[PDB]
């Protein structure tokens, strides 16, 4: 929606997720998830789990829409990946945007 945000794009992490299957997994769809985030303005939130948890609601929600608009779509799996993953960056960009104010 409106007053939101598009992050720069981010280096993205090798994140290890506990077993072989999930490691592999993704290692190999990793391409299919977002690298920037999409945020409202720092001043907004109470606090950083709030700003975090948002960025990553509304960045998972449009990035759903534009992969399914590809005809592409997501399972379970890709989503949890996701959600790990873009909480992560969503963390990084609330400390680049928290170190200016």
């Given at each position: 929606l409106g007053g939101y945000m598009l992050?720069?794009?981010?280096?993205?992490?090798?994140?290890?997720?506990?077993?072989?299957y999930e490691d592999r997994y993704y290692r190999e769809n990793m391409y299919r998830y977002p690298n920037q985030v999409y945020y409202r303005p720092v001043d907004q939130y109470n606090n950083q789990n709030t700003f975090v948890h948002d960025?990553?609601?509304?960045?998972?929600?449009?990035?759903?829409?534009?992969?399914?608009?590809k005809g592409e779509n997501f399972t379970e799996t890709?989503?949890?990946?996701?959600?790990?993953?873009?909480?992560?960056?969503?963390?990084?960009?609330?400390?680049?945007?928290?170190?200016?104010?």
């Amino acid at each position: 929606l409106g007053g939101y945000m598009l992050g720069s794009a981010m280096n993205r992490p090798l994140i290890h997720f506990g077993n072989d299957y999930e490691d592999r997994y993704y290692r190999e769809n990793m391409y299919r998830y977002p690298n920037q985030v999409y945020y409202r303005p720092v001043d907004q939130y109470n606090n950083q789990n709030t700003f975090v948890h948002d960025c990553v609601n509304i960045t998972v929600k449009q990035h759903t829409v534009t992969t399914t608009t590809k005809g592409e779509n997501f399972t379970e799996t890709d989503i949890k990946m996701m959600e790990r993953v873009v909480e992560q960056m969503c963390i990084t960009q609330y400390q680049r945007e928290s170190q200016a104010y």
